[model samples]
Target: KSKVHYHVAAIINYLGHCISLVALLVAFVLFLRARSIRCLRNIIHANLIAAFILRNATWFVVQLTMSPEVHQSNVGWCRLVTAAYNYFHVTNFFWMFGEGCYLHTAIVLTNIFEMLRIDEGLRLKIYKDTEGYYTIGIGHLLTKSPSLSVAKSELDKAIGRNSNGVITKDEAEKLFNQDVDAAVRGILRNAKLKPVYDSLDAVRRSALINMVFQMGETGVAGFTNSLRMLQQKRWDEAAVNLAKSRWYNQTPNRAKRVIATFRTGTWDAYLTDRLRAWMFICIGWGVPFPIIVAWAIGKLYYDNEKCWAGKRPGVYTDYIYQGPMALVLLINFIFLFNIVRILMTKLRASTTSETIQARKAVKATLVLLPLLGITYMLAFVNPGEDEVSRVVFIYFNAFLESFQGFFVSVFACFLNSEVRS
Candidate 1:
């Protein structure tokens, strides 16, 4: 019973991957036949699924080559596989991000990014510790012993129109500081009766609060259509009103600063752990990508030169097509890397039914080290000496190449014995 258990497990796993492969392939076929459905989001999904299919399919071919049994496995090959996986997985996600970004840009960022355009005419942009970051003249701060309206009456001219507001000093200064800061918090949250306005994110919310502070509630309220858009999350239309608003023209500096915050998220006054970490991941990935790309280009260049000239006698020059064999080598490189990784990881999980299935599937590919190696190498055997034999081999190789996807389906998918019985 224990011995028969192994075959039952094998059948289950083999059938499972094979069925999954077939389904994915059929999905691809449908995707192709539908021209109008070929939009960006769908294409991204197609490419994502396509990568997995290729990886799975390639594994199928390599498994057929391996009846049992890389470097004969090498670090470069490891690095190569890591890069390829990262490429597809990363590609899949970045496309997902693009989709999300597209949505946000339409509803949120369309309004937000317009703020970043700093007023070109503005000069002597000032900053102070007392206030977070504001231009003194255009924005408001009253010197002591004056009422709020008195100072606005005085300075509203030098600064041009309603750019400046007045803050009373000496009357409850300590308490008033807390009042202002609390007001900033309140104003941002105050934006929504619309649930979607909450979706604007932290920096945008803060920027809105700054605008309210600069312009006053009544002044900012003049942006009636803008507010409705904000609530509905109609990003572009909301931005349109602000673009021409009296508030925007008066204190354009503050408006521009608010815009900058939307773009940078936070830099000087505000900072957070997530932003730092994002920077690190982007920088980290940047480090290895160029080296990986350059190495690949180097191999293609050198290997192709040898094949076309027939100068060096190896796989490419002697037996394989110059360009195509390069792809084969890279594919072979992925094949070897996968087996090495599987042997180390999957074999340890050997007791589970699916693991057992993978074990047999993997082990079959392993045996190719000797058995299948000799067979492919035979096709390379003196193609120069016999023209007719070489031509037959070419046709044979074409059929072998074309049937790749089917083999992936045939060997890797469709049976579950323990359940079937």
Candidate 2:
């Protein structure tokens, strides 16, 4: 009989599969319900979700039968499951590879700031989305208008930087209301019916103000379709229409954070799972080797001093990182290898587009590699010349390296493909 642990593992995997199925349902609903939101970006996102549904559903079958074992025999249903499993596995990769073809253009990073907003002692009207230059209040120190300068200067003289050398909350809120939010309320009053304005919840109302405030009501009015969507209380469609603008793409990060709330209806979860394919595959293929290497490294070495410091490189930590580094090197090599093989895949067929993508991929690695914050790996590279500069670069490199996983997910999103229907 199998161990209890195996049964427990099966249960978790089954739960994940069930959750995946529900995710597909949500995706389908979002895709169908928001007809107005179906632009290239939105449609492609839907396509990616559907592909994942296929992959996860296939996983569901595999997990369903894992109760007995993965494959006890070499033939019959076991053999058939083996073949289907392998097929879905490759099928998943092909979808991701195709994603690079679709996603070469642009992506989003919206709706994360809402995370910061709900966390900590934060509240709205707290310095215009957490930036010095973005909106009013203390921001006028950097503002351009001559009239604004008089007001800011007068306020500065009256309020003066506090004993803590900070702008007080009272003063900041007053400036923001008079100069920013109030102006937006005026626009809302004029742009739509008083009833239209009254019907909205605070969150919905604030989002409307945000849209108009950034690009006056006249500019926002251009999204007539989206404005109508707002009237229908279809916030998802409205957000999509907002995102399909040059404005959203221009202010990509901020827009993504805000738009995600509409996209998923929960700031707590905003569907940034685009790289899930790469990640699922990364764990399947990339993790095992690293695990083995780490095991081997641990078996062969011991770190005496590093154990006490708990952080400094000891013999164990030194060798352990190599396992993952090997995985990274191998994956990168496979990518280059595939790029080479494609050129040879046909006679007189242009791999030019594929090749262009592969080359363009390097630009990401260029930025990512230097800044990925891959911390532990830097210890392997002796940064000796200027000790100070070395430590600074080492720490910077470590910071980026620490987020290598995050970078991969994003790169997958950035390079990942979309299918148009």
Candidate 3:
């Protein structure tokens, strides 16, 4: 019985080794190919490939060579594998951080300020004098805006200078207070005190009253009563009656606009855009992965272990790995899709736009694809049923996970654009 068990284990181990070796080779080739392309994305992909290689190498030597007991015999090797595992795991997150930063810079910072200041007639002269002024300006504005300096200066004026005898704190506070009060008074006199509703039609006023009531403001009831009196066509009396109502004080011109829009049944497209974007971001981040992970764990571990004891199977455990695998692939697809869409938006704003090269795209795919594939394989491997499949899945997963680190290091290399000093 012992001899037969040993033979079975050896055959399974050999098969596991072959699968791991093939995955490692494929990952390595992809990584090298990714490196030949010179772009920010490609570099990140290369680093991912390297991380995968390290993880696969570790698995091939430690898990595939010896029995589980023998492999666990050395605490040093165990620690080494653990360290490599942690390194690759963190690398994956770092790549995500890189993508987030790039997106932020491209979307928010780039749009917040004007970076170029030359006319076409003086373009040649400016180019000669500044060499790369536009490029540098864009880089500076994207990574760190020049407006930040203006903000700092304004803050300094409000909070006194630190230099010797420059300005006292009391003087700074007085200056800030004067500006604040003047600004507030100007807004109140020019805006809030005006009878903006006097110019609107009776129908508009009725709509505004309804909106105020819907918002739960207490003064709406009295306003509605005044509006009812106006319906009898007494313009002068209606004005006096409406003016005397407490709701008139509560209804600001700005709030009245909301009511007017509500009455007219108008929809703001910008509001729709904002709401949709918020919903997309929330759904993309929150619900999908957790549910998939839970399903994968239950199916791969609990159900399979129960089946080994000759008990009736409850659910389809073999298909459990599909959920997590699908989730990972979906995440990658969504991330890349978002990047492409954002880039397109930027391009549409200006004719001069750059496209990310194919190399970077390939590299990123290579690093992420294997990692996701192996992860799926591991979720399906059942220790109780087949030793070979378990080892194969473990080695393959480890290899792909390791490549994630190398891809991140490559990505870090392009953190700063040529324009950004």
Candidate 4:
């Protein structure tokens, strides 16, 4: 069967989008009726709503018309369609950002601690870590040399320089490798885990080793029942035990990856047979000849492949569109944090009756932003590695992304007192 059967996720997406499209139209009607609400903020609100309308409409058209044969037949036409689709799609986020910027400006304007959160740690200097100890070159803490200054001077001497010698990037790379090797060695030598480590598959083995690397040998050892569950080949039980532990509470995002790996026995297994079939129609268009021809004549188009609808894959092209979506998500989060800080501080000070009404307005705005922004964040969530969870995530993401406008409109227009008046 070359064609995707059922096409459940696609159906869900289309249904959700249709509902939102209707909801957005209702919102526009409300806006048009309420001339009294045509202030600057409402102007922004209407524009943001319009952005969603255009975005949903263009994407709806794009999804319907996008196919291997359609694109192959008219390269120029397809390129224009794709461009229009992306233009509206990206515009939605920029408008969301604009809404946030407007909120910040109205709030009397405000608001960095930089710890290297990225895995790529420092190469050249020594700095005190969160624990306030001497750390140099990709989280290499100086244990033997006690005290911060002593560690610095001693470390500098060992690397052949005076006080506070900056190590080369090559040296930093070597240390990183060395640290990884040490973690692997530590896991191999652990009597409790050695046999279990030997028997597990590549995915589980790598995940186990990664746990040890992140928390050190002792910390991973604390998951006693979790290890036992792993040995028994009871994946769900292992994940359960891991979930209840302090490690899971401490750094949930990192723990989430390992937990998913333990439960599923693979990194990413969402690419189902049905999904592959769908991709052939949407991306590959049944053959390479047409795709290659399109590429040769013009250029290959791409979008996020993991979602319900996206462009076909190009040369290393799955993540191209997702990057901007991620950055926009972060920018919105930053704005919310600032607004909340100022909001709470202002609330604590005092409020008259009129000001109480103003406070309620701010609360509504806060709720609306997250109601809209979280749909984007949900796209980044990994649904682990099983069919059940996979389908659930697909359904969830489709519902959120598609029906977001409906949800927002319900909050922003239908229930709004200003609109009713």
Candidate 5:
């Protein structure tokens, strides 16, 4: 049983990664051929495929060269293969982060578009809202004081005409313009958002304006922690903070849109095509440059007799490479919460045909993100306390980790509408 188990695990790793490598190559080719699909998002997907390919290929080198016989006689190939494997392994996770960032940004943008659609109401007549507050003209609230006469006078002042209790199309547009101006000024005046507003890109500034428009300046001001996160450019943390408010519970969809908006910002603008391409190269190959330098400078030595495999107590092989990989995985899970909440809300409230299509698009991510997280966690399974569990985990991790690229390629390329059509 023990001998069969070891061979079976090796076979799974070798065969599964071999198949996954071929699949990823094909996926990368398809991604390249489809010119229409070459958006920023798809570019990240292509880079992700490339990373997986390198990682899968390097795994073979490490597995084949790190044998006891080779280690005893010739250790150069073993050390080189080990270092390459570690580098590619880390690069794979960085590309995963790239994809997660893109998806998170896409989801947020979609929610913001929906929120703006709902908020840009074209109601012509003055009416009591669900909360019994007088509201009209694209969600323009009457007043804080709540006097009907005072509301009519403000309407006349806004439209520059005597009160008729109904607004013309042009008059409604004028009111909307004025309301948006007030919202912008409100954001500029608020101490929390004021310092950050100018530094923020157009999209984020608009998100703040939308928030102020919905909740009033004072209401948004109360979210100190959220603002702090925003100011710090901690997008995921800010989104998490936004979800913790009573306002989120009261107007969940709107809150989601605003939160999503906050989660996608300037750093996005910084990730231009040229910069992203350079970053891909830097992350994929340049990260290992320091390791190579340290090896050459005699600061670090490779252990070929027995691969430390990250148990080595130092910087390059263990800390620097592994640190970002662990953080990226953790941050992926952190961002997953907002995406799942949006999906759950959409699933419950999916009434329109448009939303039916949107739901399907959201469902595409369901296969990718959670499975990646699980497969990664499978590597760290501490089943060593039990013999049976350890044996089971060996096979489980082998299959899951090795075929991850194949699974991603199937969903991202083979089954994709862009590649199909």
Candidate 6:
């Protein structure tokens, strides 16, 4: 049994190593082939290459060191490899941040292009004059603003002008508020409210309170206090306040739906089912291949005894591990690539030939990526093991990740004229 397990583990490791190497090679080749250096695409390509190299190199060294019979060749080498692995892992995330930054910039640029109908010559002049100025302004706003300035900016740009060329603050505010309302609806839709109402789950109550708070409702402060009271085990008072917090005199239909979902358990089932279906689809496309590969390699390389065995000797002899790891890396690359392609298409359709907005968008993205990367890494390092902690971490991770993807997608849309067509 032990022998079989070792064999399976070894094969898996080897497979992972080979896959990493191949991915590194491919990414490197693409990096070398790329010619443009003045645009967001160029930065993305360069970052991708750097990230792939670091990630693959770390995986390769780790695999080599962990082989079944590779005896402790050198303690220092092992430490160095471990450090490299950590560094590269963090760096990979940083590059993802870079991609997000570019995407956000692209989206902003799209907005700018719509605002300014500059021809080629005027656009070039505007780009040369305004790029640095707006870049600094955005950077300062994003860092200092309570909420994501990019999200706000995107919303502002989308609905500011209405159908007419003339801008109206009321129209812009209405559109912006609509977006905020939509975002709140999306959160409720994803939460599966019925279960919470049926069970009267405290966590669900807290989430609802937060949502309400986001929607410009200040009355939830008492409910928040109830949460604190609950934490101190004041069950009666907490329950009372929580119910009171559910009060909505003039809420929208969506807000009512959020309340209804929690009040009746049936709503939860429908929402959960829909969410689960979407989740299945996402996993099928983005995550299943590597898991399947791992299962296959495990089944093929090891017997029942070997598989269940506790650390069998010579199990690391085969190269099967690389198969799954390589697949994961490939999937990551493909996902990012698809995002870039989408952004490129959007940019071309929306922007004119000469526009400084696109450049400003890119600059904003570059600034945001590194900041997000740092925050994400910090979150990873300081995760809490409890449910509340885990949930908080997940929420923070999702917020940053969503922003990253949104920005990148926008940037990709503006990459070239061909993309729009």
For model 6, residues 1-421, the per-residue Cα lDDT tens digits are 4465446545554554455455556545554565643333545545545555556566556755564243333244554454445445444544454444444333332232121111111111101123232111111111233344443454346645323223343443344344445445553554343223233443244345334433434343334565355445455554455454535444343334344434441233223322332332233233433443454345345622222222346554222433444454455445445545545774456434223344444444445446435544654376457566754654455445324323333333334322223
* Cα distance off (Å), candidate 2, residue 116: 12
Report the error of model 3 at residue 190, Å: 43
**Per-residue lDDT of 150 in model 3:** 47
Q: Itemize residue pairs with steric clashes in candidate 5.
A: none
Q: Give the TM-score of candidate 2.
A: 0.30
Q: How do the residues 1-421 of candidate 4 rate in per-residue lDDT, one tens digit apiece?
A: 3134238778888888988989998897777678744344455567667778887888777887777566546556666666556555555665565555655543423110011112123646877677777778877776545466677676666555564646776566556666667767878898877777877775577678767656777777776778987988989988888888887898776677667867876432211201222322222112323333343333343332322234454544423444454576577678777666756784467443323433565676667766666666566677678566766666677777888889767655633563223
229-276 per-residue lDDT for model 3 (tens digits): 444445455555554544446655433333333333222211222223
After superposition, candidate 5 runs with Cα above 4 Å error: 1-4, 72-77, 110-317, 345-358, 418-421
- RMSD over all Cα atoms, model 6: 23.8
Predicted candidate 1 versus true structure: per-residue lDDT over 1-421, tens digit per residue: 4445445544544554576567669766655666723333344335435655755564444434322112212244443443354343333233223322322222222221223222211222222324433323223344333354454554454344553443222222332343456555555455432243355554456566556555565566565666666666666566556667665687665554554444444322122211233333342233335534553454456543321222334433222222333343345445555555645763464453333443454444344233323435565566775566654555445344333334433322221121112
Best of the candidates, TM-score: 5
Off by over 4 Å in 1: 1-10, 22-48, 68-181, 184-210, 228-237, 246-421
lDDT of each: 0.42, 0.46, 0.40, 0.61, 0.67, 0.41
TM agreement with the true structure for every prediction = 0.32, 0.30, 0.30, 0.47, 0.55, 0.31
Candidate number that wins on lDDT, 1 or 6:
1
lDDT winner, 3 or 4: 4
- Give lDDT for model 6: 0.41
For model 3, the local distance difference test gives 0.40
- Stretches of model 6 off by over 4 angstroms after superposition: 67-74, 113-421
Off by over 4 Å in 4: 1-6, 72-74, 109-328, 353-362, 365-371, 381-383, 414-421
Q: Which sequence of candidate numbers ranks them by TM-score, best first? A: 5, 4, 1, 6, 2, 3
By lDDT, the better pick of 3 and 6 is 6
